Amino acid sequence: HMMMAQPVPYGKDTLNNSPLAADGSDFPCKLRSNTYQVTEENTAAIGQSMPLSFIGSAVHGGGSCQVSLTTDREPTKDSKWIVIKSIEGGCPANVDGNKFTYTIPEGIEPGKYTLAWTWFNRIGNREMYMNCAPLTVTGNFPPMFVANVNGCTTKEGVDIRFPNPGSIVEYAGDKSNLAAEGSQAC
């Protein structure tokens, strides 16, 4: 189980490392008392490299992640999300024990957004992790992939390839675990 530490999520004080509820009842962003409370506003310039980091008790052999944006500062199940980065394999890490960035690309207008990190764990229960953060962008993108909370279930043991990964894709896992190009993810 993991949670995002950078960028700083909304409602950090009540954010836990549990995945989204399987029935979709807390999608998006782990709906709770203070889901969209700004703990710390995160700020990024277009083209600026920004840190993405995580804390928790198990990386579940990694998996695959997206970084997505919505103009909604209080997203609902009907919000439109656009992917700015996909990481296929090796996210959030490969092993447990005692690395990633994203950039706001050209084509994103300055303004206020919600940023989401989503993670599909390679090993264990068929889960979707999601944490959301307030992002201010100072001054070609596909819809975010959703599975495991919507009746679409992924396959255990594989680093999934997103159907629509977008043009910014990093591979950080073991090639032997990476799903085939064009494979059905769920």
Binding mask 39-58 for Zn ion (x = CB under 5 A): -------------------x
Which of the choices Cl ion, Zn ion, none does residue 1 contact, using the CB cut-off of 5 to 8 A by kind? Zn ion
User: 1: annotated binding-site residue?
Assistant: yes
Site for Zn ion (CB under 5 A): which residue of 1, 12, 73, 126? 1
Rounded distance, CA 62 to CA 95, Å?
Answer: 7
What is the enclosing helix (H) or strand (E) of 124? Answer: none
Strands (E), the chain: 2-6, 42-44, 49-56, 63-70, 82-88, 100-103, 111-121, 129-137, 169-171
Chain centroid offset of residue 49 CA: 17
By beta-carbon proximity to Cl ion, the closer residue of 96 and 156 is 96
| Residue numbers at the binding site for Cl ion (CB under 5 A) | 96
Write down the least CB distance from residue 4 to Cl ion, Å: 14
Q: What are phi and psi of 70, to 5 degrees?
A: -135, 145
User: 60: annotated binding-site residue?
Assistant: yes
Write down the least CB distance from residue 92 to Cl ion, Å: 9
- Residues in contact with Zn ion, counted by CB under 5 A, come to a total of 2
Q: Could you tell me which residues are annotated as the binding site for Cu(+)? A: 1, 60, 74
